[PDB]
Amino acid sequence: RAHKETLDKLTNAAINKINLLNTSKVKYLVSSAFAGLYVGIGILLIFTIGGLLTDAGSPMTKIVMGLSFAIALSLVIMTGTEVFTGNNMVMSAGMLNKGVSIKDTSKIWAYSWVGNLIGALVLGIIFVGTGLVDKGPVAEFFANTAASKASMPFTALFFRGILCNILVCVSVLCSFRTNSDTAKIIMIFLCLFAFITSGFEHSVANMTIYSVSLFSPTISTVTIGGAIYNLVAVTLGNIVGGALFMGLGTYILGKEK
Amino acid sequence: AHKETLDKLTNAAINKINLLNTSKVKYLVSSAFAGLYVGIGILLIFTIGGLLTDAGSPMTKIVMGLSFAIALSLVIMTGTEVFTGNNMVMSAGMLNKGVSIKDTSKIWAYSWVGNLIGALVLGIIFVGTGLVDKGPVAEFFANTAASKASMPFTALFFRGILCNILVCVSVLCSFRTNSDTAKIIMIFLCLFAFITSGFEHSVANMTIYSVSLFSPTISTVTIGGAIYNLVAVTLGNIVGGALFMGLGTYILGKEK
Amino acid sequence: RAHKETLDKLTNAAINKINLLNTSKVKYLVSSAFAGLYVGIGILLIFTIGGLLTDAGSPMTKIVMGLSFAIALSLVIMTGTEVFTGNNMVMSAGMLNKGVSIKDTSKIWAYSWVGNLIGALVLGIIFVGTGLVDKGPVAEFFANTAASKASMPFTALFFRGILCNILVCVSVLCSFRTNSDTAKIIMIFLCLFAFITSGFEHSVANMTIYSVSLFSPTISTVTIGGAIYNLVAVTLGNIVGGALFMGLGTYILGKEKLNAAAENLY
Amino acid sequence: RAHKETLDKLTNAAINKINLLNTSKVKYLVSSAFAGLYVGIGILLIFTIGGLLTDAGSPMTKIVMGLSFAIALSLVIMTGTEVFTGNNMVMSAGMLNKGVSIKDTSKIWAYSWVGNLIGALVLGIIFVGTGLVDKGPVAEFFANTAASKASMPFTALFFRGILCNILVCVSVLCSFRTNSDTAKIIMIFLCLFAFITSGFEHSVANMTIYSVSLFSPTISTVTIGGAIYNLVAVTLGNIVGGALFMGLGTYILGKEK
Amino acid sequence: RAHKETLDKLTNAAINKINLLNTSKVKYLVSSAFAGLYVGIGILLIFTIGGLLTDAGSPMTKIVMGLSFAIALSLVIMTGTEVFTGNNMVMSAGMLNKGVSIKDTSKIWAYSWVGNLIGALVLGIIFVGTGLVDKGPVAEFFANTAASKASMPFTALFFRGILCNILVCVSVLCSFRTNSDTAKIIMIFLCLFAFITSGFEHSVANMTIYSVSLFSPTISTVTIGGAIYNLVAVTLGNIVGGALFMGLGTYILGKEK
């Protein structure tokens, strides 16, 4: 079962994370910005697909989007960069296991979250400058999707955030339990497919959604309050799924007590 | 290497009962995770089912099958405890004298209940998303639960047998390869076959019923409908996993 | 290359097969019964697919069926069970290499064939009992396909059997020439796709087609006499394909020239 | 990067090929016959697909055909059998690197070619015997395709042959540059997808196209001369792509100078 | 983590490239010509797909094209050949790490670029010679796509170039961080899926687009000056994405400070 070995690996990763931040904020933030941008790249692609297929009235739209999102977290895992959603399980487990403090945990969460946002912001501006969202079905897909995410009840967003980060974090969990990089990507592929097509909410992906929506002059269905509204609810949900379910879960499984 | 496989099944059976005797909390938490992991596969393919049924696609059941792999892949990759696979493992470990019938029924009971706890928690949180307040996906849960609860016992029993043959044989494959990619592929193929052919999985049905019982959508379900199905399918699962795969692997491996 | 090493492996597999049989008819038939069952599972899957897409008039039908048949031989290989079709190459090669005898070989063929049949019969009974073949497009796909295979001329069935088992056996051969379990599954997937979609005939798989069809009470248009006819033609087909083509072929490729402890190449 | 290692591998494979022939022509011809038939099996499949989908009026026909051809060269690589096409790169590089003579190379080309043809003749005979090409969309697909290939201008077949064997040989090249069988199969899959769907000409695959079309009693409009014409032009193109592009290219990269 | 190890690897690859160029321009240009031709092979394929599916009015056209482009960078990685785009990250990182100089970097960029073009030119001549772009939906797809690429505003081309090479270079980065060839190909497949389908601009792929369009007598939409316009704007964007984002970024993560 290797639950102790697994918890031992998560504890080390938590430690390595807080060490990296303490050693160099610039390294930690660049890492976070890359992850934020890598996740956003998955959004650019599946929203392009969403625009193309919704316009055709395809029934496969949300299925093809889910199948196509794999790159988001695959890039993060293969580049070894810092993403807020994964850090919910990692810091949580390492903290319960006395590897790191609550303060360390807050630091890592806040810095990776802000760094992820910087990467989303950067990608958004650049994407807008491509003219790819000047007008047409892709722009319209950004605008409609952003508006629907911004107007869902808090409770619904919260609970979707929870299920989303159980899925993200369990695929990160899998990556700590296999030595086959191909098996890692596959599990990531399956988990992102499940969470996208099922309708769960990913805070870091949402940053790029609102980034593009706000920066684009052609899109005007949502405001910054809406963006912040959705981001807060979903982030809170993400934290609950990652730390309360996956982090506590893996702690309980591996703790020699 | 049938002998070596039998030994692996036996050692796994021993670790299972050892875990339970050491910590119920750890055993049940492992079980609740597995029940949740399987349920997640159900959320995915019922979302697909809803979407494609609404559109009248003839591919509906085929896509549902192709998309169920995550269910058991997560269980295997996380090393957690699912009732279905435990039928073969404890059954073979028992015939091979690593564990007793008492241990076997303890494991089955605890993993079954733990799986259910996972299903219930998943159902609650999923209903809370608002994703099945109304529309084709909500309707797919209601209709699918109702057709499953109204099936004759015999039909459910036999579908339970074939389903767990498929689940247990993919577990067996996972014991006969060192490749995790090969493991996931075999699991993918076996789940594809059981979902699309129309076989019945007791743990997955737990999420089907917890979702339906928690959602405000008015089905024709009832708790007695769910229990009826779960009982018939569980017994079918036990026969397929213990009598076929369990006994079968003992016979191939037993250095007599 | 590495044909001699492969030939030794085939030979060893043959020796182990007969050793096992001699040691335990029960162990051997149980292994064969699983394989028949594992192959049949593939049939239950692709026939469900066939039923669904035929009923919808989809042109993709036979393509999707072929793409979805991989589970059949993949389960056999990954479970190390005994399937008649594969045994045709292995026993054949092992014999030519002085490892097993014509006697041992016909025994394995007979025992694995009957064993595969036991697996199909059980699966058919169990499957029919699910109610999934009571009525509808899948029941009909079984009935119609069972009828078309049994009403086909012997020559067509025979040659279809040759090509089927060439593919089945070459995929088994690939599994002897790689250490990667994933490459094994992929190669099996490719070969089973080719053979199902192109329309070749597989004897063990046909055992499940007729078992489900004979055990089913949704009409007939069949006859256990029709099944036997098909099973016989296809089986002889599978035999030459696996033994005359793949078996002899691998022997020739791998037989060290210095032996020559009986025959000379050129 | 390991170009010299690679050229050493090509040269050693070329030496092993001419040694096999000198040692045993029947072994060599049996190996070639297997290769010719393995390739032909790909044609039987994708022509069935071609038949089915052409009859459907589907725009995906040539795409699905391309994706389904991988079995052809995968079988050859995994069985270690002798196929003419790939032999163009291997014997030319090994020759340029002074491991084999010009005479050896032409012996290997002639024998693998005649051997491949023998494999295709056997397959086409057995295939017609199945009654699968007595009538229907598949028989027709065989009949039309054989006729369109035979009536093509020489220059067009020649250049198609070149690009086909660049793709065949580069995927044989990859097979020498990885120790992963899965990676090998994937590259063969991508390259065969590419050459089929783009419309390039493969001499050995054509042998099976013409053995079926000509051996089939259900009529057509090919003729033996038409078959020979296509085979000569495509074979010449295959040689140029494999030897002059891939062979010479890999020699230059890897040559100890 | 292992950023430092990754940076040593890039630096070492940078050193190996400049050494190869100094030792033999021929070996280096031939490697470059191959890569340009390998990338162009992906263009030939996905443009065939584009013609077929556009002609049929399929809404899957752009998605199937992206899914089918993996062969381009897969060949380059697996054959170990020199492509300009990937060189933007490798050289810039190697140079920042003091392994190679600014002069080495501009020399590698210019030679790989020109080498890639030669490969593009050679492929274009030969593809035209196949008769495959004589008339019909595929020739039309080249013509229309080349025109639209040449008539796009500079800023749009530039930013598309940035996002394209971040995707190309990150897949090259992943290839440096795994020992699994299969995982390399998967990551390449994903990144190329993302960049094609999203609409980003690849300078080396574009050389074949204009190669085919210009050499063909039946295509009359673009002109040489148009190709140069596109190639300049896109090459500049590619450089920024590979060197400024990816190169500078992996240095910062990796630099033992």
Ligand SMILES: CCCCCCCCO[C@@H]1O[C@H](CO)[C@@H](O)[C@H](O)[C@H]1O
């Ligand atoms: C939330 C708590 C769930 C606990 C489930 C316990 C189910 C009890 O189940 C019983 O356990 C006994 C030993 O304890 C065994 O001897 C019996 O075979 C078994 O039926």
Ligand SMILES: CCCCCCCCO[C@@H]1O[C@H](CO)[C@@H](O)[C@H](O)[C@H]1O
């Ligand atoms: C649908 C077909 C999927 C093929 C995916 C192949 C992924 C290869 O993945 C590799 O498989 C090897 C097994 O040989 C393992 O040893 C390696 O650890 C693993 O990385």
Ligand SMILES: [Cl-]
């Ligand atoms: Cl993530």
Ligand SMILES: [Cl-]
């Ligand atoms: Cl399960």
Ligand SMILES: [Cl-]
């Ligand atoms: Cl088989």
Ligand SMILES: [Cl-]
């Ligand atoms: Cl070939």
Ligand SMILES: [Cl-]
């Ligand atoms: Cl590139």
